[PDB]
């Protein structure tokens, strides 16, 4: 097709590489392409430098580290349930202080996980993604005291885990208090320990009104610095011997130790700019020439006093300014856990250094790597920020990678999540997207990186602006923090430009967020694009400017949930983003240099480049994503094709010729349909199933182990007792199902026998056995069958045994068998559909094509959406998307309507006119007049004031078409819909919430150990939860007997449930319940608390609910 | 009043704090056992420290540690630091914890329960029903009413006995 494209704003810069926040940060933390001696003191290098040297006699210092090559490639780890990682070696040397002996050694520290090209990891075989943390930047802040209007709190804040919070308050009693590790003491003391003297403090702080006198405590200047330090140590360690070396040690570790206290490079810079001073290191003071020299305490104190007096040039700090909140990317988060594991390793170093032969000690004999290996393994496997990768479709993976959580280790707890945190702070402009975020508890705590936004070296989020000088808009693009941004008047990206000059007497701009009308004389910068304000997902929404934010949120998030369809289509109405997204997400393959295409295969594409070489790109085909959607690439060139560098070679999943294809373009009618589209339900035509629209491919993984038992071995066998050859048809000789077979619920996928245990036969067994003359076999059927409501076609089997080469399983495991089962999923009643403007609904009815409304040329509509979904929801975008889609149905073209720079109504109506001629002049030529029904509908349209009275049938029909409306026949009857109806092309997706995954029922099944209540959830064949509020429902109905069933027969009354099952299978009405077991549990747990709980009858005489079994 | 002081500390029946082997043959076990094990080791070392006539400093320390063992067993976290199992930050789950809260015995298993003969699925308008009906998927119904179906299957010819009919829907 031709792709008409709307828009006037030309986009100076492209979207920056979209996973840079991950790939860059990890690179920077690893410095693995940097030659050792050239490394900076950052990332894991900085961790090493922080831990080492390690003293005490014996010294152990650190030279350098190196990262070798991955023992296995990414695909291999994904299969073998491994971790894609690199060996970590560190060249270390031991020195004896006296002897001078120096024995050197490169010691191996275990493995560190490596980030893949696309920005994700692989932990024990599964793709994971490390989410960036948002938090309060270290630094010095002044926040108002909330009790005492005219007083303020100085807060000195380090990095997480690298120091204590310090507060400086002016008490109602006049003396300046420092709070540290939750202890308030007069700051005067610490000021003394710093070498300060009432001379220096008097001259520095005398200016400020009467404040300095609250710092004057004569009883403090009375003491030399050592005496003051010991006063403080007793004040901070009550009882601990105030020994001199010990107090210097503690206070140094509290305030000057660079290996204990740490602002960021950010905390450093922020304090530098705030207090108008320069720091030496990254701590609050130093130890020089034997004494303590101040760095931050007095500057902070002066700023505090000036804020309290009222001195100009001092203000409190908006702690939600994106200038005071920074991002901890993957490298920082991993490095912190590195730092920790290293500290533990260092404790082990000092331990082994104390005892053992102090001549025969090498670095190897001193280093237990396991503390560090463990810390890293933890941070990747059980961290809050280490999430299972969402690779539902390519876009979902990308979006995940660009997420920002306020939660996690060292972050907010959900209890500590107020409003202001979750607010859309003004400085979110161009940095954090104000739409993409979850509806629910996590609202505003999980956010998305805005599209053009970037995270700088210090961790702040920057966004780009064009420079404007004397009304010329340069191409010089500056990325700013929000502290930077607050300095300028910044025009809006849409302000009109002749050439490169601002052609408007009045222009729309921001100063410090505040919206303002200014002259091009005052304009210092201008936005790059509207695209710059929203996340990638939000950017994928055409007509976003016509949608209320609440449903744009739902369109945004729901795209994440699109299932890759076997016949996916790019949307008829795109935003322009759809191509870059397939690119950056590594969906597709592209041409690496110009070339001629040699070979093209279901499995491989071979390209002959301009260097005469041959590259053989192999295609991932029908692989199973984290969510079981099919990640599979298809070849999109053919033998002989000439291709330029960056030309598409293979479409990924959800890609159509390199465009993001999250769904289908279906033909919608927007009308009620006999309630079948009530309250957001959706009607569809059987045609959609016939032509295989909204059909998706899914694979489940099934695993089984045969292990070594006290009682003998489990074995994977075809020879399973008491089964018919019926049960075994599809099992190869070793008991594993055969590739190709159709497997249904109940079918065996992998055979297995397990040994029976002390199966002392109940007399009924002995007699039954005798009657039938069959020894009860040694072993029993424990094969892996297909769970209820699952099934499909077996497509691979993996088998790993003990004694096979390359293979070593967990101890006791004899063999592991995996069976992959694929299924083609047609769309079905109760599967979920959505569109990009938050219109969502489940499919409620599939009519056969002849019932579908049709156009007079005989064409049925594909989908019928209820209008009542629109007005309340205020997402008119879909409406426009349909009108445009109408035109492109008959002209045969797609479109690109950028957000806030899109196709306006009159242009859409131009297009609709061209369409109408194509749709109606056809009929005129083929020799048919206007149908009688069309006359009737026109009459009704005339009363509705939608056409003008007097014009002709063709004139009036064109008048409707221009409004998006067409005459529509009810295929049930052939009578026309009484009015004209909105019909057009809409892009609609099948979200991951398919009913096949959700339907579930349980008669009876597994119960739990202590409660003897039923397990929960589909996977466990569990029971629904009848909670407190359901109980209230039953109580308020007075269904005492129904209620009592839920509390007794239907769970955790053992006697009652066994008895009920037998009665129902014998046609007998159900017994009376007895005591629920979990009450007996309560009684016993109270006994365990030394409390006597005692059931009583009306005579106040005990009743035994343990039927004797607990009394002697 | 003295009964607010403990001499004999009761122990909960083991099934209510099990040591279970799971699918893999590995063992899972409830925190109470480590709490009791703390308790019993400290008590035993106290009986021995008494037999061997140890100084006051030492006996006193042991007694303090014994009280805190009882404290962790009964209401861990209540006084002082909460007992953690080695190399973890997670507090151990004590009898008070088992009892109290949204997650405790009362609210979690006593005022509401999971139940048998129950299911869950996606809903769909179905405007044809009359006010008193609902559409129910067949497969859902078959499982929800499974025992009644075993019976009725036997009453007609569809299987010889209950056990055969149940084999016939597997």
């Amino acid at each position: 097709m031709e792709i008409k494209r709307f828009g006037r704003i030309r986009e100076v810069i492209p979207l920056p590489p979209l996973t840079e926040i991950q790939v860059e940060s990890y690179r920077r933390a690893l410095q693995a392409d940097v030659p050792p001696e050239k490394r900076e003191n950052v990332g894991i290098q900085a961790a090493f430098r922080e831990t080492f040297p390690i003293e005490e006699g014996l010294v152990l210092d650190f030279l350098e580290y190196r990262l070798g090559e991955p023992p296995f490639p990414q695909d291999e780890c994904r299969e073998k349930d491994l971790t894609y990682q690199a060996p970590l070696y560190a060249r270390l040397q031991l020195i004896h202080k006296d002897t001078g002996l120096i024995k050197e050694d490169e010691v191996f520290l275990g493995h560190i996980p490596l980030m893949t090209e696309d920005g994700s990891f692989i932990i024990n075989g599964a793709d994971r993604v490390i989410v960036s943390q948002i938090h309060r930047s270290p630094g010095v802040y002044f926040t108002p005291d909330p009790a005492r209007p005219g007083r303020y709190i100085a807060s000195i804040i380090p990095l997480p885990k690298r120091g204590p919070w310090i507060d400086l308050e002016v008490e109602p009693n006049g003396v300046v208090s420092m709070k540290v590790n939750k202890r308030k003491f007069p700051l005067v003391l610490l000021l003394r320990v710093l070498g300060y003297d009432q001379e220096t403090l008097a001259r520095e702080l005398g200016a400020y009104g009467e404040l300095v006198q609250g710092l004057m405590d004569e009883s403090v200047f009375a003491m030399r610095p050592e005496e003051a330090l010991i006063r403080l140590f007793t004040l901070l360690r009550p009882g601990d011997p105030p020994k001199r070396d010990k107090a210097v040690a503690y206070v140094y570790g509290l305030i000057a130790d660079p290996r204990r206290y740490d602002l960021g490079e950010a905390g450093r810079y922020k304090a530098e700019e705030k207090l108008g001073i320069r720091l030496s290191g990254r701590t609050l003071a130093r130890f020089e020439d034997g004494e303590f020299k101040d760095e931050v305490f007095l500057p902070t104190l002066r700023y505090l006093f000036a804020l309290t007096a009222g001195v100009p040039g001092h203000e409190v700090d908006d702690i939600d300014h994106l200038g005071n909140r920074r991002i901890r990317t993957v490298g920082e988060l991993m490095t912190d856990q590195f730092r920790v594991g290293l500290a533990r390793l260092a404790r082990g170093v000092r331990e082994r250094m104390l005892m053992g032969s102090e001549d025969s000690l090498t670095p190897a004999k001193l280093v237990n790597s396991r503390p560090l290996e463990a810390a890293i393994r933890e941070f990747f496997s059980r961290s809050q920020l280490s999430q299972f990768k969402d690779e539902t479709n390519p876009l979902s993976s990308l979006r995940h990678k660009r997420r920002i959580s306020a939660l996690g280790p060292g972050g907010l707890t959900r209890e500590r999540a107020g409003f202001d945190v979750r607010d859309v702070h003004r400085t979110h402009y161009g940095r954090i997207c104000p739409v993409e975020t979850p509806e629910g508890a996590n609202i505003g705590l999980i956010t998305s990186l805005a599209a053009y936004a970037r995270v700088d070296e210090l961790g702040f989020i920057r966004t780009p602006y064009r420079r404007v000088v004397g009304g010329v808009v340069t191409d010089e693009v500056v990325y700013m923090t929000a502290t930077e941004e607050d300095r300028y008047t910044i025009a809006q990206a849409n302000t009109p430009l002749e050439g490169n000059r601002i052609a408007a007497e009045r222009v729309v701009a921001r100063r410090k967020g505040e919206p303002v009308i200014v002259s091009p004389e005052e304009v210092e910068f201008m936005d790059v694009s509207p695209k710059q304000v929203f996340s990638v997902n939000t950017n994928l929404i055409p007509f976003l400017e016509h949608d209320d934010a609440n449903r744009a949120l739902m369109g945004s998030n729901m795209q994440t949930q699109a299932v890759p369809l076997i016949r996916a289509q790019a949307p008829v109405v795109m935003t322009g983003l759809e191509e870059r997204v397939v690119r950056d997400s590594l969906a597709a393959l592209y041409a690496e240099e110009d070339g001629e295409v040699a070979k093209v295969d279901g499995n491989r594409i071979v390209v002959r480049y301009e260097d005469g070489r041959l590259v053989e790109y192999p295609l991932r085909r029908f692989y199973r994503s984290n969510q079981g959607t099919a990640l599979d690439q298809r070849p999109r060139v053919v033998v002989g094709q000439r291709v330029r560098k960056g030309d598409l070679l293979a479409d990924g999943p959800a890609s159509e010729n390199g465009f993001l294809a999250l769904g289908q373009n279906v033909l919608v009618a927007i009308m009620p349909f006999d309630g079948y589209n009530f309250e957001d339900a959706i009607v569809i035509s059987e045609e959609l199933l016939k032509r295989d629209f909204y059909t998706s491919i899914h694979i489940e993984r099934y695993e089984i182990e045969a292990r070594d038992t006290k009682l003998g071995p489990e074995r994977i066998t075809r020879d399973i007792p008491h089964l018919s050859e019926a049960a075994l048809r599809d099992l190869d000789e070793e008991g594993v199902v055969r590739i190709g077979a159709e497997v249904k619920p109940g079918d065996i996928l992998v055979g297995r026998t397990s040994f029976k245990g002390e199966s002392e036969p109940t007399p009924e067994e002995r007699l039954l056995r005798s009657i039938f003359g069959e020894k009860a076999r040694d072993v029993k059927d424990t094969s892996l069958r297909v769970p209820p409501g699952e099934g499909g076609i077996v497509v691979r089997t993996v088998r790993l045994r003990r004694g096979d080469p390359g293979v070593e399983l967990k101890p006791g495991v004899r063999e592991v068998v995996r069976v992959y089962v694929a299924q083609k999923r047609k769309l079905q009643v109760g599967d979920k559909l959505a569109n990009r403007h938050g219109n969502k609904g489940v499919v409620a009815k599939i009519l056969p094509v002849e019932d579908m409304p049709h156009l007079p040329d005989g064409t049925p509509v594909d989908v019928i959406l209820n209008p009542l979904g629109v007005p309340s929801r205020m997402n008119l975008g879909q409406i426009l998307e349909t009108h445009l889609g109408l035109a492109g149905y008959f002209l045969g073209q797609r479109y690109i309507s950028p957000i806030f720079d899109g196709a306006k109504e009159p242009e859409i109506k131009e297009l609709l006119a061209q369409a109408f001629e194509v749709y109606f002049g056809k009929r005129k030529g083929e020799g048919f007049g206007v149908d009688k029904r069309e006359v009737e509908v026109l009459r009704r349209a005339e009363k509705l004031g939608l056409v003008t009275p007097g014009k002709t049938p063709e004139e009036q029909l064109k008048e409707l078409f221009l409004q998006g409306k067409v005459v529509l026949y009810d295929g049930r009857t052939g009578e026309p819909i009484e009015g004209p109806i909105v019909v057009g092309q809409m892009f609609i997706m099948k979200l991951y919430h398919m009913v096949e995954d959700k339907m579930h029922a349980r008669s009876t099944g597994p119960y739990s150990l202590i409660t003897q209540q039923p397990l929960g959830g589909k996977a466990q064949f569990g029971g629904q939860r009848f909670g407190e509020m359901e109980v209230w429902a039953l109580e308020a109905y007075g269904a005492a007997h129904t209620l009592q069933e839920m509390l007794t027969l239907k769970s955790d009354d053992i006697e009652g449930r066994n008895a009920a099952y037998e009665a129902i299978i014998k046609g007998e009405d159900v017994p009376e319940p007895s005591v629920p077991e979990s009450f007996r549990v309560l009684v016993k747990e109270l006994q365990a608390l030394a409390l006597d709980v005692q059931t009583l009858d009306e005579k106040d005489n005990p009743v035994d609910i343990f039927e004797g079994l607990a009394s002697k | 009043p003295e009964w607010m002081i403990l001499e004999a500390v009761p122990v909960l029946p083991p099934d209510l704090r099990p040591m279970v082997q799971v699918d893999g043959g590995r063992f899972a076990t409830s925190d109470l056992n480590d709490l009791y094990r703390r308790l019993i080791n400290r008590n035993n070392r106290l009986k021995k420290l008494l037999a061997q006539g140890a100084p006051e400093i030492i006996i006193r320390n042991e007694k303090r540690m014994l009280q805190e063992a009882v404290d962790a067993l009964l209401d861990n976290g209540r006084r002082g630091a909460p007992v953690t199992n080695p190399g973890s930050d997670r507090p151990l789950r004590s009898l008070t914890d088992i009892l109290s809260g949204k997650q405790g015995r009362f609210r979690q298993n006593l005022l509401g329960k999971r139940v048998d003969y129950s299911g869950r699925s996606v809903i769909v308008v179905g405007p044809q029903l009359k006010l008193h009906q609902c559409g129910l998927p067949k497969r859902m119904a078959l499982e929800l009413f499974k025992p009644f179906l075993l019976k009725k299957m036997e009453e007609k010819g569809i299987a010889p006995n209950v056990k055969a009919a149940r084999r016939m829907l597997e």
Binding site: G239, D240, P241 | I57, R60, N61, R64, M65, E68, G80
Partner: peptide, 14 residues
Amino acid sequence: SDPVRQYLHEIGQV
């Protein structure tokens, strides 16, 4: 309060 500081003190007596 901290049952280890307690014992380090009682130790600090003899």
